[PDB]
Every structure is written in structure tokens, then in C-alpha cells.
């Protein structure tokens, strides 16, 4: 989509792996605020928003906290308390036609600044100080939108760039987007430290003979002693006995 028509989206309720990015592309512009890219896959978030669009070459720097310009001040501006990051990879093999591709536009003229994450589509004809030249030409009768017009002769500064901005939330978050992905082969009949879906303990595991009802996950004997557990992978019931101990 265009700069003034970014594609807002929400991505929640998923085991989110931020390492599918690195096999994609050279990642010309990749810098993260508030969280390191290396330590992303582990952390959890409230709501992850993604905005996708395309801009020119020498304006990729303008998508930053507190930076003023013409694409930042007129049609897309993100706050100073932004947490997240931006990912831009130069793309002029799929966006530039020979002669100028008048398909991508950008509001070039307007009246004032916009509030954070304020997207507008109105395409009225700009004023002329006095009662303007509505739908005609004259002194300063400039349509507000302007096409990019890419061609394969533009310098690297004028080439099209695809860019996605991810806005995270980290304060008090109800983990909805984060991945663990870490399991180990099961060991039986040996004193083993186990962590079954959060239940942590020690003991010897033995094949079970008791019928768990299908909605049950844990088993208890008298006095709340956890006696059995069902595997979250193979759904087998397992018996727990504390390994041998005593006084000498």
C-alpha cells in the first residue's frame, strides 16, 4: 500500500518466531527501539501491530522517533514513545516501470501536522489563500497527492523501498505473541528432573494404569501429592514415584 494508506493489522494469539525475517533479504534498514532483535523470539507482547508501505530512497531515515520532514510531517508520523522497530529492504525489481510508474502516491501538500497513527485519504484540492481555484488552475493550485513515478534510471536515492513498521507493547503484557519451542526426548525409569507444561518436580517415571478423563491434565493422591501426569506430546499417562531415599 501507499504511504498514506498503510495497512494496519493486528497479529495475536500465536507462537511468534521473529527469526523468519533473517532468511528473507539483505535487510538494508533494520534498527530496533526498546528491544534487541537477537533477544526478540523469547520476549512476549500484548498486541503487535504491523504497518506496510513503500517510500523513496533518501527518506527512509525519516521514519524515526521525533524526526521532522515531508513524509513524517504530512502523511505518516509515529510517536516519541515508540517501542518496536522498522524493517526496510530496497525493492526496485518489482516497483519501477520504464518511463515512470504513476501508481504510488503520497500527500505532498496539506495544512498542518498529524497526530500519531493518523491516516487520512481525503483528496480535495488545496487552497489558494483567498477562496481558491477549486478544480481549476492558477497561482498555487496544487493537488495534495503526488505520484512517485519510478523508472529504472533513478539513482539509488530515488529508488522504491518497501518498509514495515512493527509497534509492540511490553508493559503488563498478556502473552499472546511469543514462542518457546523447546522440548526433549522423554526418559523413563530413572530419577529425572521434569517440567511438564509448568509442573516441575523430580522422580522416577513409570507406565500408568489409571484412566484420566480427557479434560484432565494432572493427578493427585491424598494430601495433594502429584502422583501422575499426562504428556502434552504423546498424551500418555505417566506415574511419578519419588526415588529411593532413607536414613543410614
Amino acid at each position, epitope marked *: 500500500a501507499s504511504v498514506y494508506a498503510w495497512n494496519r493489522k493486528r497479529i495475536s494469539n500465536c507462537v511468534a518466531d521473529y527469526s523468519v525475517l533473517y532468511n528473507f533479504a539483505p535487510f538494508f534498514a533494520f534498527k530496533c527501539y526498546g528491544v534487541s532483535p537477537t533477544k526478540l523470539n523469547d520476549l512476549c507482547f500484548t498486541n503487535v501491530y504491523a504497518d506496510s508501505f513503500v517510500i523513496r530512497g533518501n527518506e527512509v531515515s525519516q521514519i524515526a522517533p521525533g524526526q521532522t520532514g515531508n513524509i513524517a510531517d504530512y502523511n505518516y508520523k509515529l510517536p516519541d514513545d515508540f517501542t518496536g522497530c522498522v524493517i526496510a529492504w530496497n525493492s*526496485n*525489481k*518489482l516497483d*519501477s*516501470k*520504464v*518511463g515512470g*510508474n504513476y*501508481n504510488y502516491r503520497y500527500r505532498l501538500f496539506r495544512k498542518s501536522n498529524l497526530k500519531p497513527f493518523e491516516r487520512d485519504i481525503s483528496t480535495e484540492i488545496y487552497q489558494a489563500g483567498n477562496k481558491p481555484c477549486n478544480g481549476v488552475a492558477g497561482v498555487n493550485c496544487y493537488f495534495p497527492l503526488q505520484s512517485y513515478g519510478f*523508472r*529504472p*534510471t*533513478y*539513482g539509488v536515492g530515488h529508488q522504491p523501498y518497501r518498509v514495515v513498521v512493527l509497534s509492540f507493547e511490553l508493559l503488563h503484557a498478556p502473552a499472546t505473541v511469543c514462542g518457546p519451542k523447546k522440548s526433549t526426548n522423554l526418559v523413563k525409569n530413572k530419577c529425572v528432573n521434569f517440567n511438564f507444561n509448568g509442573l516441575t518436580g523430580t522422580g522416577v517415571l513409570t507406565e500408568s494404569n489409571k484412566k484420566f478423563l480427557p479434560f484432565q491434565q494432572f493427578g493427585r493422591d491424598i494430601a495433594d501429592t502429584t502422583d501422575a501426569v499426562r504428556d502434552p506430546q504423546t498424551l500418555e499417562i505417566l506415574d511419578i514415584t519419588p526415588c529411593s531415599f532413607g536414613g543410614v
Partner: antibody, heavy 118, light 108 residues
Framework: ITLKESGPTLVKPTQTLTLTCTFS??????????VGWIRQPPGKALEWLAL???????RYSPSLESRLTITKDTSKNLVVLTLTNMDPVDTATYYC???????????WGQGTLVTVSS | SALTQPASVSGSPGQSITISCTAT?????????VSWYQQYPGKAPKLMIY???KRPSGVSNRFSGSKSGNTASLTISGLQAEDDAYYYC?????????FGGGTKLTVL
């Protein structure tokens, strides 16, 4: 990727020449991909004719535009070029090559020699 | 007028040679994409190299491009008798794709 040209081999002066280029291996739906036409007089250099992008944005040669209405059909992967008012300058070979943005004309067809005379 | 290519060249078999196709015309843009085509003796030209210092997988390892400013020096090392053919250059200008005046290579 493969291309093959076809059409009338003979045409008379001031006539409407038609050519059909059928390809296989790719389509006109993925981004960046386009298909263009090229001509070559005997013993001379090549020249452009038209281009059909994947989004159905079309381009013609500046000098010889207002002609050669190039159409297409994405179901059977076929392109059609039609240029009327045949002149003896247009007696040349004709190629339909698929164009990408950096690798200009990386897949050419065979090419058919066409004559404009009695 | 748009580009410029030498008439023909004849290099003894097994040496190297570079050819220039200067534009000799202002505002062809950034002059960044420059492709070279192989014209056989009456066949459809085949792409040899594009993006001058780059080269498409599928061709030999003797051709190598360079750019001395406003031209593209297409080089051919270890000339073999198979190399007798025509060569052309191609790069869009502001309004439309343009070609070189052509070059002939006969190996003797």
C-alpha cells in the same frame, strides 16, 4: 521458460500485420515479469516494439506509437501484437522476449521473418 | 547517436579484448543497467551479461564487464574460434530502451 512466435509469413503493403507469441513456464501474474517485442532488419540492429507488464500497464515505442495495439490472454499464456499499414521498412525479423527489470530480454523466442511486398 | 559501437573487430584466437560502447549523450540517467547481447549468424540474440560487473549464470567464465565512465567495456578472454559473432549493448534512456550500433567479431 519457453517462447514461440506464430502468424502470417506474407503480408501486402498497407496491410494489418498480426503476430501471436505463446509462452510456457511462466505467466503474466507474478510481479516484475513483463513481455516485450523486438524487431531486426536484415543485417541491422534490433529495435523495440511494445511491452506488456504483469499488471496490464502497457508501453509502446515513442516514434511508432498510436499503432500496434498489443493485447494478451493470461489463461493460455498468449500475447498478441498487431501493427497495421505495412511498409517495406517493416520487413524484418520479430522476437517476443520476456522482460524483467534488470535482466532485460533474458528469454527470447525463435523469431519469424516477414516480408511486405507483392 | 544514442550509443556508439565500433564497426568490427578481429582478434587472434586465445587472447583478450575489451570493447567500448560509449553513449556520447548527456542524461541517459545514472547509466547503471547495461546489458550485452550475442547475435548469432542469423539467430535471436542471447543475453551474455547484464549489470556489467555481474553476469548471468548459464554462460562461460571468460566474459567480464567494466565501466570506464559513460561506456561499458565488455571483455572477452581466451578467444576461441567459436566466438565469431555479433555483439550489441542495450540500456534504457529516459524515454525508451536503446541499443548499440553493433559490432562484428571474426576470429583468425
Amino acid at each position: 521458460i519457453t517462447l514461440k512466435e506464430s502468424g502470417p509469413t506474407l503480408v501486402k503493403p498497407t496491410q494489418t500485420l498480426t503476430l501471436t507469441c505463446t509462452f510456457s513456464g511462466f505467466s503474466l501474474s507474478t510481479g516484475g515479469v513483463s513481455v516485450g517485442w523486438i524487431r531486426q532488419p536484415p543485417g541491422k540492429a534490433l529495435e523495440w516494439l511494445a511491452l506488456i507488464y504483469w499488471d496490464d500497464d502497457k508501453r509502446y515505442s515513442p516514434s511508432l506509437e498510436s499503432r500496434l495495439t498489443i493485447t494478451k490472454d493470461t489463461s493460455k499464456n498468449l500475447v498478441v501484437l498487431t501493427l497495421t499499414n505495412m511498409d517495406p521498412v517493416d520487413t524484418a525479423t520479430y522476437y517476443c522476449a520476456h522482460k524483467t527489470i534488470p535482466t532485460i530480454f533474458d528469454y527470447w523466442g525463435q523469431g519469424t521473418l516477414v516480408t511486405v511486398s507483392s | 547517436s544514442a550509443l556508439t559501437q565500433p564497426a568490427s573487430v578481429s582478434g587472434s584466437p586465445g587472447q583478450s579484448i575489451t570493447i567500448s560502447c560509449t553513449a556520447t549523450s548527456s542524461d541517459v540517467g545514472a547509466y547503471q543497467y547495461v546489458s550485452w547481447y550475442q547475435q548469432y549468424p542469423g539467430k535471436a540474440p542471447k543475453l551474455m551479461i547484464y549489470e556489467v560487473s555481474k553476469r548471468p549464470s548459464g554462460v562461460s567464465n571468460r566474459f567480464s564487464g567494466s565501466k570506464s565512465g559513460n561506456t561499458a567495456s565488455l571483455t572477452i578472454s581466451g578467444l576461441q574460434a567459436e566466438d565469431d559473432a555479433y555483439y550489441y549493448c542495450n540500456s534504457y534512456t529516459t524515454s525508451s530502451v536503446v541499443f548499440g550500433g553493433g559490432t562484428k567479431l571474426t576470429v583468425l
